[PDB]
Amino acid sequence: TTIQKYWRMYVVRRRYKIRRAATIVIQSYLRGYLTRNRYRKILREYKA
Amino acid sequence: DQLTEEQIAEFKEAFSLFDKDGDGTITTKQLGTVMRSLGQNPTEAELQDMINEVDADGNGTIDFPQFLTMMARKMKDTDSEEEIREAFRVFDKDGNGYISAAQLRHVMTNLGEKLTDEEVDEMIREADIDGDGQVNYEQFVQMMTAK
Amino acid sequence: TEEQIAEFKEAFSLFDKDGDGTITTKQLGTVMRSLGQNPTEAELQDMINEVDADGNGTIDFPQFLTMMARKMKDTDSEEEIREAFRVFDKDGNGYISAAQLRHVMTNLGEKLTDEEVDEMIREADIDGDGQVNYEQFVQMMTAK
Amino acid sequence: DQLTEEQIAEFKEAFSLFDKDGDGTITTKQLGTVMRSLGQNPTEAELQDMINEVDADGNGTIDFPQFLTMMARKMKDTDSEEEIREAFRVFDKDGNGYISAAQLRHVMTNLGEKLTDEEVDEMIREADIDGDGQVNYEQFVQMMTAK
């Protein structure tokens, strides 16, 4: 029983941490394109 | 015995993760999934004990203060992975650290907390155990040590 | 390449409104996200603290280029994002629900604002309950 | 910074030109036209900065000493047509180096300084700019070469 509980919790924690890291990278990438759009708008205004 | 604000923030983050309703309530099954996700170390019987301690009022959902309370209890528990290694050695009939996957599955499922074959196959994949050939569990308990 | 460094200097000068020649930490992060790299909030603060260990709050160009090298190392290909989404996707065919993505993104790591959630939902044109592809969304974010 | 005699002669010739009254105190609106026709490449923000300096000097009217001083601060500016070509290319949506005259007009007028439609047509005119067709960048190169 101890090994069952320990195994299942460690596996779930590991998968949860992997998912959290992947989604944090995804969130950074999503902020990326909006910031790129703002920077492109600034460049476009300066060129105008 | 109080959780550090870093662990408090991480556990509130997981709390919001499981806030499918979003009102600050956690189901008992949702609480068990949270327990597995956080790496805290209860027994299924201990899980039911924590559940009924929460449900002494009868709400059936877990709030954040009592959440921090049993998390303090759980870090006070502080199980050791060397005990897990000794349990494996007792489980290992050979005693050399190499035990067949069939024996592991049988002992793993037919004692106390029964497990589905899907979970056993997932553990085999995680522990790279071979059904026929003996595969050392020392690597998998080394990964257990990370918690 | 040299053209990349020249464009980085151009952005450095244009963002600097006072023209001092060294950007501010808030401007630093803004241009970090604007230049194309994807800074995770923990590592974003990590590089912020590494730069501001001197405490000036201003970013000099040589160290700026060095941590541009750090950023381009940090940059993740579209394939990793698609694989992560597929792992999150129950179907596994590249079609994922937007509601699940919204909740996962908001809860995990940084808190994602509702306006930003709507922004990425409209960009990806993924229905909240429907199963729509996340991939072309990833490539068009990369292209921008 | 003091220029040659011919420089100041040309400057005073333009001074007499735009001085419809010949008083010697020219308002800011006409001073901007003087600056642009004289050979400078002034930013509208830089023009407004010059206007603020004139207003600090007072009366919003230019004098030839102030005129020569702001010459001395303005000749230092120099622009390369490659940068403007890159600006037009990034203005171009397709990125092939060819942007429609209507699209160019809309892109230039919607943001930045709200340049009037008649001077946009004057851009189209005298440069063989095709209204519906995409604008040749060599036309713009020649226009900036003529300044």
Tab-separated table of C-alpha atoms in Angstrom:
chain	number	residue	atom	x	y	z
A	1	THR	CA	0.000	0.000	0.000
A	2	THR	CA	2.814	2.426	0.823
A	3	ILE	CA	4.519	1.721	-2.507
A	4	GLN	CA	1.202	2.072	-4.368
A	5	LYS	CA	0.452	5.488	-2.895
A	6	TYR	CA	4.052	6.681	-3.280
A	7	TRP	CA	4.289	5.542	-6.909
A	8	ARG	CA	0.987	7.084	-7.956
A	9	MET	CA	1.689	10.413	-6.256
A	10	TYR	CA	5.200	10.682	-7.687
A	11	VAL	CA	4.003	9.868	-11.208
A	12	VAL	CA	1.102	12.331	-11.006
A	13	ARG	CA	3.378	15.039	-9.587
A	14	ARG	CA	5.932	14.436	-12.345
A	15	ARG	CA	3.339	14.651	-15.119
A	16	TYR	CA	1.802	17.739	-13.489
A	17	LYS	CA	5.191	19.469	-13.313
A	18	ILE	CA	5.894	18.627	-16.964
A	19	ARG	CA	2.492	20.017	-17.950
A	20	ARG	CA	3.070	23.161	-15.875
A	21	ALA	CA	6.454	23.823	-17.481
A	22	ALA	CA	5.080	23.254	-20.986
A	23	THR	CA	2.130	25.572	-20.362
A	24	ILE	CA	4.375	28.270	-18.871
A	25	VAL	CA	6.508	28.156	-22.021
A	26	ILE	CA	3.280	28.303	-24.040
A	27	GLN	CA	2.087	31.365	-22.102
A	28	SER	CA	5.417	33.102	-22.704
A	29	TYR	CA	5.129	32.309	-26.412
A	30	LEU	CA	1.576	33.701	-26.449
A	31	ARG	CA	2.644	36.975	-24.854
A	32	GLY	CA	5.398	36.925	-27.462
A	33	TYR	CA	3.247	37.517	-30.533
A	34	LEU	CA	1.242	40.334	-28.935
A	35	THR	CA	4.462	42.075	-27.920
A	36	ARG	CA	5.780	41.491	-31.454
A	37	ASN	CA	2.649	43.156	-32.830
A	38	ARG	CA	3.157	46.153	-30.541
A	39	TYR	CA	6.821	46.437	-31.573
A	40	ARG	CA	5.842	46.193	-35.246
A	41	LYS	CA	3.276	48.950	-34.702
A	42	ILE	CA	5.955	51.153	-33.116
A	43	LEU	CA	8.284	50.515	-36.061
A	44	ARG	CA	5.464	51.234	-38.515
A	45	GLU	CA	4.685	54.545	-36.800
A	46	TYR	CA	8.350	55.590	-36.814
A	47	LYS	CA	8.668	54.700	-40.501
A	48	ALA	CA	5.467	56.642	-41.212
B	1	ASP	CA	4.563	23.906	11.502
B	2	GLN	CA	3.241	26.258	8.820
B	3	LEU	CA	3.692	26.131	5.063
B	4	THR	CA	6.172	28.539	3.524
B	5	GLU	CA	4.666	31.246	1.341
B	6	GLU	CA	6.321	29.699	-1.726
B	7	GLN	CA	4.658	26.338	-1.089
B	8	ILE	CA	1.461	28.192	-0.158
B	9	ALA	CA	1.526	29.927	-3.545
B	10	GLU	CA	2.211	26.671	-5.403
B	11	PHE	CA	-0.604	24.887	-3.573
B	12	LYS	CA	-2.995	27.773	-4.248
B	13	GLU	CA	-1.947	27.519	-7.903
B	14	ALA	CA	-2.870	23.826	-7.914
B	15	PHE	CA	-6.050	24.773	-6.027
B	16	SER	CA	-7.056	27.125	-8.839
B	17	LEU	CA	-6.032	24.420	-11.324
B	18	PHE	CA	-8.590	22.068	-9.797
B	19	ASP	CA	-11.072	24.945	-9.356
B	20	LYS	CA	-13.153	23.695	-12.261
B	21	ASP	CA	-16.127	25.320	-10.547
B	22	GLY	CA	-13.808	28.171	-9.555
B	23	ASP	CA	-15.614	28.958	-6.291
B	24	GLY	CA	-12.829	27.661	-4.041
B	25	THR	CA	-14.167	24.134	-3.456
B	26	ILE	CA	-12.358	20.827	-3.994
B	27	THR	CA	-14.059	17.449	-4.338
B	28	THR	CA	-12.778	14.506	-2.304
B	29	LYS	CA	-11.670	12.776	-5.508
B	30	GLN	CA	-10.340	16.143	-6.667
B	31	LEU	CA	-8.543	16.426	-3.326
B	32	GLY	CA	-6.964	13.006	-3.843
B	33	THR	CA	-5.829	14.018	-7.318
B	34	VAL	CA	-4.375	17.173	-5.745
B	35	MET	CA	-2.606	15.003	-3.168
B	36	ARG	CA	-1.034	12.939	-5.936
B	37	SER	CA	-0.101	16.071	-7.896
B	38	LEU	CA	1.594	17.789	-4.942
B	39	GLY	CA	3.701	14.766	-3.999
B	40	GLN	CA	2.411	14.747	-0.428
B	41	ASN	CA	2.293	11.240	0.987
B	42	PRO	CA	-1.005	9.943	2.411
B	43	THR	CA	-2.442	6.450	2.583
B	44	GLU	CA	-5.816	5.774	0.966
B	45	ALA	CA	-7.103	5.115	4.480
B	46	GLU	CA	-5.247	8.251	5.572
B	47	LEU	CA	-6.839	10.005	2.589
B	48	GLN	CA	-10.290	9.038	3.855
B	49	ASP	CA	-9.273	10.150	7.353
B	50	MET	CA	-8.282	13.576	6.034
B	51	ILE	CA	-11.495	13.696	3.989
B	52	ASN	CA	-13.697	13.046	7.019
B	53	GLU	CA	-11.689	15.495	9.136
B	54	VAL	CA	-12.495	18.114	6.499
B	55	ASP	CA	-16.117	16.928	6.248
B	56	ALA	CA	-16.696	17.084	10.005
B	57	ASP	CA	-18.846	20.099	9.122
B	58	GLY	CA	-20.362	18.050	6.290
B	59	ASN	CA	-19.612	20.339	3.338
B	60	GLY	CA	-17.834	17.650	1.318
B	61	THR	CA	-15.345	20.179	-0.083
B	62	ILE	CA	-11.903	21.278	1.103
B	63	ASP	CA	-11.132	24.924	1.831
B	64	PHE	CA	-7.723	26.583	1.749
B	65	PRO	CA	-7.062	26.953	5.534
B	66	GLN	CA	-7.723	23.297	6.338
B	67	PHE	CA	-5.797	22.525	3.150
B	68	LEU	CA	-2.716	24.240	4.580
B	69	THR	CA	-3.410	22.467	7.880
B	70	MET	CA	-3.224	18.915	6.601
B	71	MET	CA	-0.342	19.910	4.315
B	72	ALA	CA	1.510	20.917	7.474
B	73	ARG	CA	0.588	17.509	8.879
B	74	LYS	CA	1.848	15.819	5.703
B	75	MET	CA	5.233	17.517	5.767
B	76	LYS	CA	5.371	16.536	9.436
B	77	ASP	CA	4.925	12.947	8.204
B	78	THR	CA	8.079	13.013	6.029
B	79	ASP	CA	8.265	9.457	4.746
B	80	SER	CA	11.665	8.116	3.698
B	81	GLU	CA	12.593	6.545	0.367
B	82	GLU	CA	15.064	4.179	2.049
B	83	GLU	CA	12.058	2.563	3.719
B	84	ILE	CA	10.689	2.145	0.189
B	85	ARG	CA	13.968	0.491	-0.832
B	86	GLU	CA	13.725	-1.897	2.123
B	87	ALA	CA	10.106	-2.642	1.201
B	88	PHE	CA	11.243	-3.452	-2.341
B	89	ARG	CA	14.016	-5.702	-1.014
B	90	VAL	CA	11.451	-7.569	1.086
B	91	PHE	CA	9.233	-7.705	-2.007
B	92	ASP	CA	12.199	-8.852	-4.101
B	93	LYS	CA	12.269	-12.597	-3.465
B	94	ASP	CA	15.719	-12.695	-5.065
B	95	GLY	CA	16.812	-9.816	-2.828
B	96	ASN	CA	19.324	-8.526	-5.398
B	97	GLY	CA	17.120	-5.618	-6.483
B	98	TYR	CA	15.838	-7.474	-9.563
B	99	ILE	CA	12.229	-8.682	-9.416
B	100	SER	CA	9.902	-9.839	-12.186
B	101	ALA	CA	7.138	-7.518	-13.350
B	102	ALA	CA	4.450	-10.181	-12.872
B	103	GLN	CA	5.307	-10.599	-9.183
B	104	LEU	CA	5.460	-6.819	-8.790
B	105	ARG	CA	2.016	-6.437	-10.375
B	106	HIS	CA	0.486	-9.217	-8.273
B	107	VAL	CA	1.867	-7.883	-4.982
B	108	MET	CA	1.045	-4.352	-6.152
B	109	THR	CA	-2.629	-4.988	-6.922
B	110	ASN	CA	-3.813	-7.820	-4.670
B	111	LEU	CA	-2.822	-6.151	-1.372
B	112	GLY	CA	-4.691	-3.334	0.334
B	113	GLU	CA	-5.193	-0.551	-2.195
B	114	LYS	CA	-6.109	-2.420	-5.371
B	115	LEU	CA	-4.736	-0.926	-8.587
B	116	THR	CA	-6.014	-1.174	-12.144
B	117	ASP	CA	-3.912	-2.894	-14.790
B	118	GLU	CA	-3.629	0.463	-16.577
B	119	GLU	CA	-1.806	1.981	-13.599
B	120	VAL	CA	0.454	-1.079	-13.386
B	121	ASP	CA	1.348	-0.793	-17.076
B	122	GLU	CA	2.009	2.926	-16.604
B	123	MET	CA	4.325	2.137	-13.686
B	124	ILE	CA	6.094	-0.507	-15.786
B	125	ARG	CA	6.643	2.089	-18.508
B	126	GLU	CA	7.912	4.590	-15.928
B	127	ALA	CA	10.117	1.984	-14.216
B	128	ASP	CA	11.190	0.328	-17.521
B	129	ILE	CA	10.523	-3.063	-15.924
B	130	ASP	CA	10.530	-6.130	-18.177
B	131	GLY	CA	7.794	-8.719	-17.745
B	132	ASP	CA	10.098	-11.691	-18.311
B	133	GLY	CA	13.577	-10.320	-17.645
B	134	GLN	CA	14.435	-8.999	-14.209
B	135	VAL	CA	14.901	-5.215	-14.154
B	136	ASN	CA	16.435	-3.381	-11.204
B	137	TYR	CA	14.024	-1.183	-9.252
B	138	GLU	CA	16.885	0.890	-7.812
B	139	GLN	CA	16.601	3.407	-10.656
B	140	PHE	CA	12.868	3.793	-10.058
B	141	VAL	CA	13.287	4.298	-6.318
B	142	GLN	CA	16.086	6.762	-7.095
B	143	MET	CA	13.462	8.661	-9.080
B	144	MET	CA	11.114	8.205	-6.102
B	145	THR	CA	13.746	9.976	-3.989
B	146	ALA	CA	13.107	13.161	-5.987
B	147	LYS	CA	9.458	13.160	-4.826
C	1	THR	CA	24.003	37.382	-37.331
C	2	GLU	CA	25.244	40.954	-37.712
C	3	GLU	CA	21.895	42.013	-39.188
C	4	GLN	CA	20.144	40.628	-36.107
C	5	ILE	CA	22.429	42.647	-33.821
C	6	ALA	CA	21.829	45.753	-35.943
C	7	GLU	CA	18.053	45.326	-35.690
C	8	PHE	CA	18.411	44.756	-31.944
C	9	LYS	CA	20.336	48.032	-31.668
C	10	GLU	CA	17.657	49.757	-33.758
C	11	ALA	CA	14.942	48.527	-31.393
C	12	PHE	CA	17.160	49.508	-28.452
C	13	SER	CA	17.418	53.084	-29.722
C	14	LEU	CA	13.752	53.411	-30.702
C	15	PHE	CA	12.443	52.050	-27.391
C	16	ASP	CA	14.769	54.375	-25.477
C	17	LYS	CA	12.686	57.553	-25.340
C	18	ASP	CA	15.238	59.467	-23.261
C	19	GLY	CA	18.034	58.312	-25.570
C	20	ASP	CA	20.381	57.434	-22.706
C	21	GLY	CA	21.643	54.328	-24.507
C	22	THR	CA	20.529	51.810	-21.859
C	23	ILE	CA	16.987	50.461	-21.529
C	24	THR	CA	14.892	50.043	-18.372
C	25	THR	CA	14.033	46.683	-16.803
C	26	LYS	CA	10.353	47.077	-17.699
C	27	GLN	CA	11.409	48.128	-21.196
C	28	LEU	CA	13.884	45.242	-21.047
C	29	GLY	CA	11.130	42.668	-20.561
C	30	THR	CA	8.841	44.387	-23.056
C	31	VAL	CA	11.494	44.174	-25.763
C	32	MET	CA	12.364	40.628	-24.655
C	33	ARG	CA	8.848	39.521	-25.503
C	34	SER	CA	8.705	41.818	-28.547
C	35	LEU	CA	11.927	40.573	-30.175
C	36	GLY	CA	10.441	37.108	-30.742
C	37	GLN	CA	11.816	35.161	-27.784
C	38	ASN	CA	9.451	33.581	-25.258
C	39	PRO	CA	10.544	34.338	-21.669
C	40	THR	CA	9.021	32.143	-18.986
C	41	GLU	CA	8.148	34.319	-16.002
C	42	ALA	CA	10.506	32.514	-13.619
C	43	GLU	CA	13.365	32.684	-16.122
C	44	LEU	CA	12.255	36.195	-17.106
C	45	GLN	CA	12.845	37.299	-13.516
C	46	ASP	CA	16.030	35.200	-13.482
C	47	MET	CA	17.553	37.152	-16.377
C	48	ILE	CA	16.183	40.399	-14.918
C	49	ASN	CA	18.030	39.711	-11.660
C	50	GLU	CA	21.166	38.610	-13.523
C	51	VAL	CA	21.212	41.914	-15.412
C	52	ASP	CA	20.276	44.040	-12.379
C	53	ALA	CA	22.784	42.361	-10.053
C	54	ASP	CA	24.779	45.566	-10.520
C	55	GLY	CA	21.623	47.367	-9.368
C	56	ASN	CA	21.743	50.112	-12.004
C	57	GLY	CA	18.452	49.143	-13.626
C	58	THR	CA	19.990	49.888	-17.035
C	59	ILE	CA	20.994	47.328	-19.669
C	60	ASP	CA	24.293	47.759	-21.500
C	61	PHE	CA	24.633	46.544	-25.075
C	62	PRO	CA	27.382	43.864	-24.685
C	63	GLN	CA	25.621	42.026	-21.859
C	64	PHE	CA	22.417	42.625	-23.821
C	65	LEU	CA	23.879	40.708	-26.776
C	66	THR	CA	25.130	37.960	-24.458
C	67	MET	CA	21.668	37.438	-23.052
C	68	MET	CA	20.279	37.658	-26.598
C	69	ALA	CA	22.394	34.554	-27.124
C	70	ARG	CA	20.764	33.238	-23.950
C	71	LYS	CA	17.303	34.083	-25.346
C	72	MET	CA	17.889	32.419	-28.713
C	73	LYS	CA	18.985	29.363	-26.761
C	74	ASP	CA	15.748	29.756	-24.771
C	75	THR	CA	13.608	29.963	-27.919
C	76	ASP	CA	11.515	26.832	-28.461
C	77	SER	CA	10.507	25.485	-31.851
C	78	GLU	CA	6.884	25.192	-32.933
C	79	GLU	CA	7.125	21.394	-32.772
C	80	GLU	CA	7.602	21.463	-28.996
C	81	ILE	CA	4.517	23.660	-28.581
C	82	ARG	CA	2.428	21.361	-30.789
C	83	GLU	CA	3.615	18.302	-28.853
C	84	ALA	CA	2.788	19.984	-25.538
C	85	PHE	CA	-0.685	20.886	-26.810
C	86	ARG	CA	-1.205	17.323	-28.066
C	87	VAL	CA	-0.260	16.064	-24.605
C	88	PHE	CA	-2.838	18.495	-23.226
C	89	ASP	CA	-5.226	17.490	-26.018
C	90	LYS	CA	-7.459	14.551	-25.136
C	91	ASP	CA	-8.074	13.700	-28.798
C	92	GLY	CA	-4.382	13.778	-29.698
C	93	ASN	CA	-5.163	14.730	-33.311
C	94	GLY	CA	-4.153	18.382	-32.924
C	95	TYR	CA	-7.736	19.552	-32.271
C	96	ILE	CA	-8.127	20.895	-28.730
C	97	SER	CA	-10.849	22.769	-26.871
C	98	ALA	CA	-10.272	26.461	-26.206
C	99	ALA	CA	-11.947	26.361	-22.779
C	100	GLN	CA	-9.497	23.738	-21.515
C	101	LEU	CA	-6.595	25.745	-22.930
C	102	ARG	CA	-7.887	28.927	-21.285
C	103	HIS	CA	-8.220	27.313	-17.864
C	104	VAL	CA	-4.872	25.502	-18.100
C	105	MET	CA	-3.032	28.635	-19.252
C	106	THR	CA	-4.613	30.857	-16.593
C	107	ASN	CA	-4.072	28.427	-13.716
C	108	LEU	CA	-0.608	27.138	-14.655
C	109	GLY	CA	2.299	29.506	-14.084
C	110	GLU	CA	1.492	33.141	-14.747
C	111	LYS	CA	-2.109	34.278	-14.481
C	112	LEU	CA	-3.397	34.971	-17.991
C	113	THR	CA	-5.696	37.980	-18.249
C	114	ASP	CA	-9.177	37.450	-19.663
C	115	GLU	CA	-8.607	40.020	-22.413
C	116	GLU	CA	-5.453	38.168	-23.466
C	117	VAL	CA	-7.366	34.876	-23.334
C	118	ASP	CA	-9.964	36.336	-25.695
C	119	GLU	CA	-7.160	37.694	-27.884
C	120	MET	CA	-5.503	34.303	-28.354
C	121	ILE	CA	-8.908	32.615	-28.719
C	122	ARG	CA	-9.864	34.951	-31.566
C	123	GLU	CA	-6.422	34.611	-33.161
C	124	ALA	CA	-6.491	30.804	-32.976
C	125	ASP	CA	-10.234	30.876	-33.859
C	126	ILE	CA	-10.656	27.847	-31.576
C	127	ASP	CA	-14.117	27.251	-30.139
C	128	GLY	CA	-14.309	26.909	-26.372
C	129	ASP	CA	-16.063	23.545	-26.555
C	130	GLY	CA	-15.199	22.683	-30.150
C	131	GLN	CA	-12.025	20.926	-31.259
C	132	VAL	CA	-9.926	23.227	-33.456
C	133	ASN	CA	-6.253	23.029	-34.395
C	134	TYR	CA	-3.636	24.891	-32.359
C	135	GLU	CA	-0.820	24.353	-34.864
C	136	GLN	CA	-1.343	27.069	-37.489
C	137	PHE	CA	-1.875	29.411	-34.539
C	138	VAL	CA	1.626	28.487	-33.343
C	139	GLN	CA	3.242	29.020	-36.744
C	140	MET	CA	1.521	32.363	-37.308
C	141	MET	CA	2.604	33.533	-33.858
C	142	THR	CA	6.134	32.473	-34.833
C	143	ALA	CA	5.955	34.378	-38.131
C	144	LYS	CA	4.803	37.604	-36.457
D	1	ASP	CA	28.921	76.655	-36.660
D	2	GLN	CA	29.251	79.293	-39.389
D	3	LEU	CA	28.816	78.316	-43.037
D	4	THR	CA	30.136	79.937	-46.217
D	5	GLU	CA	28.926	83.211	-47.712
D	6	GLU	CA	27.031	81.437	-50.500
D	7	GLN	CA	25.194	79.329	-47.914
D	8	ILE	CA	23.904	82.394	-46.064
D	9	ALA	CA	23.160	84.064	-49.410
D	10	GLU	CA	20.893	81.186	-50.439
D	11	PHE	CA	19.359	81.152	-46.959
D	12	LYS	CA	18.544	84.865	-47.137
D	13	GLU	CA	17.199	84.404	-50.670
D	14	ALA	CA	14.718	81.844	-49.342
D	15	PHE	CA	14.133	84.218	-46.415
D	16	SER	CA	13.081	86.978	-48.814
D	17	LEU	CA	11.025	84.449	-50.789
D	18	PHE	CA	8.801	83.174	-48.001
D	19	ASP	CA	8.627	86.657	-46.449
D	20	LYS	CA	5.510	87.768	-48.298
D	21	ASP	CA	5.752	91.011	-46.299
D	22	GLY	CA	9.545	91.284	-46.145
D	23	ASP	CA	9.380	92.201	-42.461
D	24	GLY	CA	12.028	89.702	-41.348
D	25	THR	CA	9.823	88.052	-38.695
D	26	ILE	CA	8.234	84.961	-40.259
D	27	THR	CA	5.649	82.909	-38.389
D	28	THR	CA	6.219	79.266	-37.503
D	29	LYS	CA	3.921	77.851	-40.200
D	30	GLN	CA	5.868	79.531	-43.000
D	31	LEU	CA	9.177	78.917	-41.208
D	32	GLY	CA	8.510	75.191	-41.509
D	33	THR	CA	8.078	75.578	-45.263
D	34	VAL	CA	11.334	77.559	-45.339
D	35	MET	CA	13.094	74.746	-43.491
D	36	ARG	CA	11.736	71.998	-45.726
D	37	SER	CA	12.410	73.826	-49.000
D	38	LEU	CA	15.861	74.949	-47.855
D	39	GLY	CA	17.323	71.440	-47.925
D	40	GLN	CA	16.727	70.085	-44.437
D	41	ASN	CA	15.117	66.761	-43.507
D	42	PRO	CA	13.162	67.719	-40.385
D	43	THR	CA	10.948	65.447	-38.338
D	44	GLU	CA	7.506	66.840	-37.523
D	45	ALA	CA	8.385	66.279	-33.867
D	46	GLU	CA	11.696	68.040	-34.516
D	47	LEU	CA	9.785	70.839	-36.248
D	48	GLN	CA	7.594	71.205	-33.165
D	49	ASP	CA	10.724	71.231	-30.993
D	50	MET	CA	12.018	74.094	-33.129
D	51	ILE	CA	8.650	75.808	-32.645
D	52	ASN	CA	8.981	75.417	-28.869
D	53	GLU	CA	12.460	76.943	-29.023
D	54	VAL	CA	11.075	79.850	-31.065
D	55	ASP	CA	8.221	80.341	-28.588
D	56	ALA	CA	10.751	80.387	-25.749
D	57	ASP	CA	12.564	83.024	-27.795
D	58	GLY	CA	9.169	84.698	-28.118
D	59	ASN	CA	6.535	85.946	-30.570
D	60	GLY	CA	6.584	82.704	-32.554
D	61	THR	CA	8.512	84.515	-35.302
D	62	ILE	CA	11.948	83.641	-36.674
D	63	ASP	CA	14.959	85.945	-36.829
D	64	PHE	CA	18.032	85.323	-38.952
D	65	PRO	CA	20.339	84.845	-35.911
D	66	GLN	CA	17.996	82.194	-34.503
D	67	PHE	CA	17.642	80.890	-38.061
D	68	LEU	CA	21.419	80.502	-38.404
D	69	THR	CA	21.725	78.851	-34.985
D	70	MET	CA	19.102	76.264	-35.844
D	71	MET	CA	20.862	75.740	-39.173
D	72	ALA	CA	23.983	75.024	-37.126
D	73	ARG	CA	22.076	72.434	-35.108
D	74	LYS	CA	20.243	71.011	-38.161
D	75	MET	CA	22.892	70.394	-40.853
D	76	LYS	CA	24.237	67.574	-38.662
D	77	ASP	CA	21.255	65.424	-39.707
D	78	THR	CA	21.758	63.094	-42.680
D	79	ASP	CA	19.586	60.239	-43.958
D	80	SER	CA	20.361	57.295	-46.247
D	81	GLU	CA	17.797	56.176	-48.822
D	82	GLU	CA	18.339	52.525	-47.868
D	83	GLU	CA	16.557	53.116	-44.554
D	84	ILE	CA	13.576	54.686	-46.334
D	85	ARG	CA	13.538	51.781	-48.799
D	86	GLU	CA	13.413	49.373	-45.850
D	87	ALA	CA	10.606	51.468	-44.352
D	88	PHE	CA	8.623	51.188	-47.583
D	89	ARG	CA	9.336	47.450	-47.778
D	90	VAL	CA	8.067	46.844	-44.242
D	91	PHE	CA	5.094	49.036	-45.151
D	92	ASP	CA	4.496	46.653	-48.056
D	93	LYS	CA	2.270	43.783	-46.951
D	94	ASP	CA	3.573	41.240	-49.467
D	95	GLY	CA	7.189	42.258	-48.863
D	96	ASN	CA	8.150	41.967	-52.541
D	97	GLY	CA	9.173	45.630	-52.707
D	98	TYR	CA	5.996	46.922	-54.379
D	99	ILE	CA	3.128	48.655	-52.562
D	100	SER	CA	-0.059	50.017	-54.111
D	101	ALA	CA	-0.423	53.793	-54.157
D	102	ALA	CA	-3.848	53.601	-52.514
D	103	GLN	CA	-2.439	51.204	-49.914
D	104	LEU	CA	0.564	53.489	-49.401
D	105	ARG	CA	-1.734	56.492	-48.964
D	106	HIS	CA	-3.910	54.674	-46.435
D	107	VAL	CA	-0.916	53.344	-44.485
D	108	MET	CA	0.788	56.740	-44.380
D	109	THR	CA	-2.338	58.756	-43.573
D	110	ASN	CA	-4.176	56.579	-41.033
D	111	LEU	CA	-1.271	56.791	-38.567
D	112	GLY	CA	1.454	59.360	-38.076
D	113	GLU	CA	0.844	62.942	-39.097
D	114	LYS	CA	-2.493	63.321	-40.896
D	115	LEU	CA	-1.136	64.508	-44.230
D	116	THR	CA	-3.802	66.020	-46.468
D	117	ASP	CA	-5.213	64.266	-49.523
D	118	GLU	CA	-4.113	66.957	-51.988
D	119	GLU	CA	-0.443	66.498	-51.104
D	120	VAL	CA	-0.907	62.723	-51.309
D	121	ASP	CA	-2.119	63.290	-54.873
D	122	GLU	CA	0.931	65.515	-55.349
D	123	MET	CA	2.942	62.475	-54.260
D	124	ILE	CA	1.127	60.446	-56.920
D	125	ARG	CA	1.670	63.251	-59.423
D	126	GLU	CA	5.140	64.365	-60.600
D	127	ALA	CA	6.544	60.892	-59.783
D	128	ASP	CA	4.703	58.643	-62.290
D	129	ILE	CA	3.106	56.817	-59.357
D	130	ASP	CA	0.422	54.374	-60.503
D	131	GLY	CA	-2.644	54.772	-58.306
D	132	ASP	CA	-4.085	51.271	-58.567
D	133	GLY	CA	-0.784	49.583	-59.380
D	134	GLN	CA	2.053	48.998	-56.958
D	135	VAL	CA	4.504	51.871	-56.550
D	136	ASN	CA	7.997	51.389	-57.943
D	137	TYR	CA	10.601	51.885	-55.224
D	138	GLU	CA	13.024	53.432	-57.721
D	139	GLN	CA	10.568	56.314	-58.068
D	140	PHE	CA	10.845	56.924	-54.319
D	141	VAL	CA	14.633	56.609	-54.522
D	142	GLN	CA	14.704	59.320	-57.189
D	143	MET	CA	12.259	61.475	-55.219
D	144	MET	CA	14.481	61.395	-52.136
D	145	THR	CA	17.558	61.952	-54.308
D	146	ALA	CA	15.843	65.137	-55.472
D	147	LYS	CA	14.858	65.532	-51.786
